Amino acid sequence: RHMLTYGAPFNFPRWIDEHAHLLKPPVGNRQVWQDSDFIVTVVGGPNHRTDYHDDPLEEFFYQLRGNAYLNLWVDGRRERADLKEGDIFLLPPHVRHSPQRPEAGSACLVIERQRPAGMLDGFEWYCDACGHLVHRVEVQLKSIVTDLPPLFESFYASEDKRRCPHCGQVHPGRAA
Amino acid sequence: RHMLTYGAPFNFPRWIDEHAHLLKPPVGNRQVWQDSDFIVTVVGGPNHRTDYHDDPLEEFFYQLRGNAYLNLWVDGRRERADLKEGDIFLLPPHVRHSPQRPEAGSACLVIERQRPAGMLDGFEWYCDACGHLVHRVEVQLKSIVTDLPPLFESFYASEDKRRCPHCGQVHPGRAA
Ligand SMILES: N=C1C(C(=O)O)=CC=CO[C@H]1O
Ligand SMILES: N=C1C(C(=O)O)=CC=CO[C@H]1O
Ligand SMILES: [Fe+2]
Ligand SMILES: [Fe+2]
Ligand SMILES: [Fe+3]
Ligand SMILES: [Fe+3]
Ligand SMILES: [O-]
Ligand SMILES: [O-]
Q: Chain A 102-161, CB below 8 Å of chain B: which residues?
A: 109, 111, 113
Question: Is A38–B6 a contact, with Cβ atoms under 8 angstroms apart?
Answer: no
Q: How many domains does chain A have?
A: 1
Give CA angle at B100 (B98, B104), nearest 5°.
155
**B63 in Cβ contact with B84 (< 8 Å):** yes
Resolution of the experimentally solved model in angstroms: 1.6
Separation CA B24–CA B13 (nearest Å): 16
**B36 in Cβ contact with B55 (< 8 Å):** no
- Give the closest residue to A139 by CA, choosing from A127, A122, A152, A153: A122
Q: What is the DSSP string of B63-77?
A: EEES-EEEEEEETTE
Asked, for residue B164, whether it belongs to a domain, the answer is: yes
Q: How was this structure determined?
A: X-ray
Ligand 7: residue whose CA is nearest its atom 1: A53
Separation CA B101–CA B67 (nearest Å): 7
Separation CA B102–CA B161 (nearest Å): 27
Question: Is B62–A13 a contact, with Cβ atoms under 8 angstroms apart?
Answer: no
**Annotated binding-site residue numbers of A:** 49, 53, 59, 97, 101, 112, 127, 130, 164, 167
Asked, for residue A133, whether it belongs to a domain, the answer is: yes
Asked, for residue A160, whether it belongs to a domain, the answer is: yes
Asked, for residue B18, whether it belongs to a domain, the answer is: yes
Tell me the residue ranges of DSSP E strands in chain B.
Answer: 10-11, 29-31, 38-43, 52-54, 59-65, 68-74, 77-83, 87-91, 97-100, 107-113, 121-126, 133-139
3 state SS of A61: strand
Question: Is A87–B5 a contact, with Cβ atoms under 8 angstroms apart?
Answer: no
3 state SS of A113: strand
Q: Tell me which chain B residues have a C-beta less than 8 angstroms from the C-beta of A67.
A: none
Asked, for residue B1, whether it belongs to a domain, the answer is: no
Asked, for residue B4, whether it belongs to a domain, the answer is: no
Burial class (CB in 10 A: 0-12, 13-18, 19+), A26: exposed
Domain of residue A20, residue span: 11-176
Asked, for residue A135, whether it belongs to a domain, the answer is: yes
Q: Is beta strand B121-126 parallel, antiparallel or unpaired with respect to B133-139?
A: antiparallel
Phi, psi of B42 (to 5 degrees): -110, 130
Asked, for residue B2, whether it belongs to a domain, the answer is: no
